[PDB]
Structure 1
Amino acid sequence: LGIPRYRPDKAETEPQVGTAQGLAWTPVGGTLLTIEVAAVPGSGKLSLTGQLGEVMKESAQAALTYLRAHTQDYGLPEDFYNKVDLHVHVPDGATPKDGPAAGITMATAIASALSRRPARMDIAMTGEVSLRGKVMPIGGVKEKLLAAHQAGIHKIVLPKDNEAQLEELPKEVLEGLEIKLVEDVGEVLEYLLLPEPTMPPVV
């Protein structure tokens, strides 16, 4: 055939600070978007790059706003909002992504970055977020689960409004994937994030 053209999606083993696994359905099916965010110091400013559409812009804004009113609930700094520079990066800078179904994934990334506790990349995330933390359901979750199972992910996080969606999931896929059901991100942010931080946050 020739040279390796593409590279398969791989479930990264080591949990890394400021990273979050994600699943974004595409014309070729859901993809394991590796959401990358930053918590570099400075003044208050939000950066949304990687061809991030508005449907993701207000999604990230809503997730950050929820984290702003839940500082001690997840161990965030008490004075971060004025003194944080958030740069939500999504692979690939060329890919013009669309849709707010990755609200939990981006929220998990910023949460891990602020709390300095790496999220579980070995787990896949899907579902948008509100200011109350309630995780709304999505459309087309079977493709996301399929991609997560194929890429080596064995654990999934799903909103507690999507139980009706699991019957259409493929059989051999569903047993091999443990399905965590969450009503709000207040259950995701302790099941995913490590119970301890590794590297110190920005002061």
Structure 2
Amino acid sequence: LQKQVEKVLRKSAYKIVSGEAESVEVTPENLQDFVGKPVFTVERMYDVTPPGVVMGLAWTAMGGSTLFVETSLRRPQDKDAKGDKDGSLEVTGQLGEVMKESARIAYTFARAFLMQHAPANDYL
């Protein structure tokens, strides 16, 4: 914000010294020429959160952030209806060792939760 305000003030100074305008009254209507078109047009990645993706909060080094944990079915559900093989999980995001263990724990807990609340759902 300091950079942006300094930029607008610099352009106002240019518009004052040599420019016709002796004084400047900055408004959003004028703002487009002082700094340009807006960068962050979206408050978020989206506002629908389709199935398999959920928003979460992260305490990163440069303050806080809102990160969307996403999930996808990277292989067809029914290779063979008789097929009894377990649903191996793939994970990305520069995951650390402790985070790998935490992801495994969460996966098993979700599996057990579906077992309890929806036994017919063998999806997970």
TM-score, structure 2 length as denominator?
Answer: 0.49
Larger radius of gyration: 2
TM-score, structure 1 length as denominator?
Answer: 0.33
Higher strand share: 1
Higher helix share: 2
Q: Which has the higher contact order (CA 8 A, sep 6+)?
A: 1
